[PDB]
Amino acid sequence: MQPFVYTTAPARIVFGTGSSVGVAEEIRRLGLSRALVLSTPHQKGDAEALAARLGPLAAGVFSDAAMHTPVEVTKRAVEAYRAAGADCVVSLGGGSTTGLGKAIALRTDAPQIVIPTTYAGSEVTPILGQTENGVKTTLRGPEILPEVVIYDAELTLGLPVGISMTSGLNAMAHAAEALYARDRNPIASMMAVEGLRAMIEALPGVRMEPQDTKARETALYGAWLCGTVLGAVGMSLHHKLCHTLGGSLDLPHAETHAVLLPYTIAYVEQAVPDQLAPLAALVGGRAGTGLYDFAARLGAPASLAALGVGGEDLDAMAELATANPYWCPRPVEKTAIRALLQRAFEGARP
Amino acid sequence: MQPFVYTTAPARIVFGTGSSVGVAEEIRRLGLSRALVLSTPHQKGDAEALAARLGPLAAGVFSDAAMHTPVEVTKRAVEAYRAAGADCVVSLGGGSTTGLGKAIALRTDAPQIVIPTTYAGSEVTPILGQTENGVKTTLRGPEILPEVVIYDAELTLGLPVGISMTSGLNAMAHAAEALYARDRNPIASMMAVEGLRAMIEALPGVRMEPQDTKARETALYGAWLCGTVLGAVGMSLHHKLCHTLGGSLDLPHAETHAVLLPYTIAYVEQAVPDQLAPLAALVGGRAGTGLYDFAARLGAPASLAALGVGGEDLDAMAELATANPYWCPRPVEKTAIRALLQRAFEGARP
């Protein structure tokens, strides 16, 4: 056996269809009483309805969360948190909403109750990416990890199919990289395999019937495990490239994951195919090409060209990706990253 | 899916052969500097050798750890801890030594760094048993769960084969009951299966070659996961029966588990075969009868009669077993418990 470290941090994860009826009780369980409910504009009404349900337990709604968690928006949200007299945040939504809550927590020590409605998995990680002056940078710390998460699959029925598929691939990216992360361990790897298995089973079902509560519950269960293993063992080249392009080119985030994943996994698989073998098994092929084929079954975008990236962007992106790199089992110098980005731009099978 | 709550607390688990060289580093990482090193009288030499190596970071050695964690010993240990200006404990050795550290932690808030040398699994539970002027008590709480565990298989090579087998079966019992816990969750269940797989692989290897570090590492990995699930979810018939029956008759603890497990698992398996299916699949298609066959493979005692129990004792045991009502997936009824005890007394196939 390879040596390892396995670490747990304090968290309370509530999982079940209809579990979101318990938001009030979870606020009270923390000894708190004035939540700022957070959303993007895409779930503004849902946030307002939740705030109304909370009554005296809601201090207000901030519905302006933004992709890539830009510092300008965080500054507004913190001012709103302070002015409202809030004592916690309730983050209703996807990864952008969770990210805002984390950015507020970093600045204010606000406890977070997160109600995820996508497969981003941010709700169970101590990691925060924030964008400032065209660069997204990541931080990790106990201040960032949400105290409480409420998983209610009924809240995912309305997630549009397209973003359901690419958010699903975003979840899979977490688990795939967990298999070869610097801080990998056998339990995180077991959980990563189960998360991948769940996503591979569920996403085609969700595509076939977006209102299928069984397929939605399986996908959300998978996303929980995929996010958990990201939080536990960290990340590598794939996440670095997503953060680089996402931040700097303002690319659609889940879509960037979906497009890059077959290429970044194919690259790493050349060096550690044994570590990626369990993923290769689940996709019924090689890990990289198998992901490309699976993403095609889901109808996900397959090229960076489809995301509006220009060939002229790639040099700068390859250079930026070598600043503050994430650990990788293969060397990831600028020449190699540029070639990988060229492959992803073209969108052909790895 | 069955809804669940998954709660974690802070813990760092360091796993690897030779890892015990890293105790100083773990004390430093906690920001602590005055460790009271704990042991039994036998491991006094080992404890003093560790304290010497710790230099500035050791406050002293207390080497009077005793079975069942008697309050008289704890009082002397706490007096030593407080007089030395200690700020944590290092619990080197068996379950008794882990218990002493927990008893000190209860009273002093001492962080615990546990270096287990057995399969007790106490190092990853929030449970503490104590004896006070003869009175055995059990408590549980977050203050009891050790902050740090260092698993070094090289420290387990001296565990005699007999107790290795029966304590290994006792560890498996935690995982088997975790699969049907009232508060079962997917992470505890995955851990449970993995712990069972590890013990099923390792224990026969240990029996063949007790000095084999590969088999020993796998067994210690199994013990960690089985202890973790003991710590995470509620046990049931098997544990309640071993506790009451072993406690009342002062029967050898691990041996009682080893004898009863096939029968108690068989009993529950009649009602919830699907929950035990992941275990049944590891032991030939039926969990209860499979565990009977597996235990025989290890040379474990196979009957209550082999543990000194007489036919005339069974009535009283059945009364004790049904004296204190608790949750089980199958009704616990005296008639069925009588039949279970008779089968266990005879050492017959379940």
Secondary structure (DSSP) of B36-66: EEE--STTHHHHHHHHHHHGGGEEEEE----
Put simply, the answer to whether B12 touches A5 (Cβ < 8 Å) is: yes
Place of tokens 């207000």: A60
Q: Count the helices and strands in chain A (H runs, E runs).
A: 13, 9
**Hey, which CATH number is domain A161-350, 3.20.20.105, 1.20.1090.10, 1.10.1200.10, 3.40.50.300?**
1.20.1090.10
Q: Tell whether B8 lies on the interface with A, counting CB pairs under 8 A.
A: yes
| Cβ neighbour number for residue A312 with a 10 Å cutoff | 7
Rounded distance, CA A71 to CA A100, Å? 9
Rounded distance, CA B167 to CA B160, Å? 11
Residues with their C more than 2.5 Å from the N of the next written residue in chain B, i.e. before a break, are none
Put simply, the answer to whether B3 touches A12 (Cβ < 8 Å) is: no
Which residues 165-204 of chain B have a CB within 8 Å of chain A?
185-187, 190-191, 194
A187: chain B residues, CB-CB within 8 Å: 191, 194, 225
- Contact between residue B288 and residue B266 where contact means Cβ atoms under 8 Å apart: yes
Rounded distance, CA B322 to CA B248, Å? 13
Tokens encoding B62: 């207390």
Letter for the amino acid at B183? D
Rounded distance, CA A140 to CA A231, Å? 9
Strand partners, A8: B11
Q: How was this structure determined?
A: X-ray
Q: Report helix, strand and coil shares of chain A as percent, to nearest 5.
A: 60, 15, 30
At how many Å resolution was this determined? 1.5
| Residue boundaries of the structural domains of chain B | 1-160, 161-350
| Cβ neighbour number for residue A111 with a 10 Å cutoff | 19
Q: Minimal CA–CA distance to B149: which of B50, B53, B225, B87?
A: B225
Q: Tell whether A229 lies on the interface with B, counting CB pairs under 8 A.
A: no
Torsion of CA B330, B333, B336, B342, to 10 degrees: 120
Rounded distance, CA A189 to CA B191, Å? 12
Q: In what order do the strands lie in the sheet with B11-15?
A: A4-8, B11-15, B148-151, B112-116, B88-93, B35-38, B58-62
What's the topology of domain B1-160? Answer: Rossmann fold (3.40.50)
Q: Residue A260 to residues A183, A266, A341, B55, B87: CA-CA distances in angstroms?
A: 22, 10, 8, 51, 49
Tokens encoding B85: 């200006």
Q: Which of B6, B123, B229 to mutate to test the interface with A (most CBs of A within 10 A)?
A: B6
Report DSSP letters for A55-108, one per residue.
Answer: GGGEEEEE----TT-BHHHHHHHHHHHHHTT-SEEEEEESHHHHHHHHHHHHHH
Phi and psi dihedrals of A58, rounded to 5? -105, 130
Rounded distance, CA A198 to CA A188, Å? 15
Closest residue, chain B, to A12 (C-alpha): B7
B123: chain A residues, CB-CB within 8 Å: none
Put simply, the answer to whether B3 touches A11 (Cβ < 8 Å) is: no
